[PDB]
């Protein structure tokens, strides 16, 4: 991918770039999943051994405060601002807010809301004044790449994301193990209740949570499961990685062309009875200028 930017890339030191990042040492891990309830179209399988070079990855998804500093330094205009609208979950649209009649096929709970963007995540009248440490949302893949490049960083590949998110466990269901709520404690911000009608907020949040909410995983990463979907670098496919080759098993970058970029980790909307996509092996995608109230990103970097 060759992006184009309207701002110069600032000079940064290695110690500056590394702040708030964890160093993931080079090695192998078992990527993917073979849960028999996985949707075949998602291509969670096959489970395979992948070797990665050492890399750095953010402990936290990029926050509102951090994205605001990027915009202040660059004047960057997000895709949602250029389009003039972004997707908001229906329960979070205040009554009377102007809305487009647009319907996402098979997902009527998404509302296209004029004027919804990162600083007004539910549309005109909303603000992030009380969410400075929440993950930035309504950021497209393009916006995420622009931020990461400005920060001296990049998006993680899907394999880097999953190795970091698995936190040193071998083929566990979640970042922390195989139980959703070990010892009866919530470990991530997903949906409880009846999707999409009523979120009981049993885990504390019926929207995004601060980027440092909940226990981290074994590598020190926070909210890799739940909270917000996270953009990765790869083009999406369901079967490129089924090939057993160096390109798919050693620092794999995904297919060279595609239509949608990979997103990982699930969000505050995921639930077992609809998508079941908060398992660490889960994956989906979205087109690269798309944005939504449940999608953000964390950065990676080469040491």
């Amino acid at each position: 991918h060759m992006p184009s930017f309207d701002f110069d890339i600032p000079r940064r030191s290695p110690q500056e770039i590394a702040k708030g990042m964890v160093a993931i040492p080079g090695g192998t891990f078992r990527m993917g999943g073979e849960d028999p309830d996985a949707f075949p179209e998602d291509g969670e399988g096959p489970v395979r051994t992948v070797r990665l070079s050492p890399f750095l990855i953010d402990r936290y998804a990029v926050s509102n405060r951090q994205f605001a500093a990027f915009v202040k330094a660059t004047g960057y205009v997000t895709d949602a601002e250029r389009y003039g609208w972004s997707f908001v979950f229906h329960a979070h649209v205040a009554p009377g807010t102007p809305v487009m009649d647009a319907v996402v096929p098979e997902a009527p709970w998404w509302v296209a809301v004029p004027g919804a963007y990162w600083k007004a995540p539910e549309g005109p009248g909303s603000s992030i004044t009380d969410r400075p440490n929440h993950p930035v949302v309504h950021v497209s893949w393009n916006d995420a790449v622009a931020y990461a490049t400005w920060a001296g960083k990049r998006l993680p590949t899907e394999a880097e994301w999953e190795m970091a998110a698995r936190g040193g466990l071998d083929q566990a269901r979640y970042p922390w193990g195989n139980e959703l709520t070990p010892r009866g404690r919530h470990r991530c911000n997903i949906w409880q209740g009846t999707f999409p009608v009523h979120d009981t907020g049993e885990d504390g949040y019926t929207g995004t949570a601060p980027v440092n909410a909940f226990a981290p995983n074994g590598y020190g990463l926070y909210n890799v499961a739940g909270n917000v979907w996270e953009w990765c670098a790869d083009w999406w496919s369901a079967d490129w990685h089924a090939t057993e080759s160096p390109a798919t098993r050693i620092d794999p970058r995904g297919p060279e062309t595609g239509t949608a970029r990979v997103t990982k980790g699930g969000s505050f909307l995921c639930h077992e009875s609809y998508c079941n996509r908060y398992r660490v092996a889960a994956r989906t995608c979205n087109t690269p200028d798309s944005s939504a109230a449940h999608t953000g990103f964390r950065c990676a970097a080469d040491p």
Partner: peptide, 14 residues
């Protein structure tokens, strides 16, 4: 009835 949808795309509403 079809694959659940978690990533709403701008193209999908056209």
């Amino acid at each position: 009835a079809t694959t659940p949808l978690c990533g709403p795309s701008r193209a999908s509403i056209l």
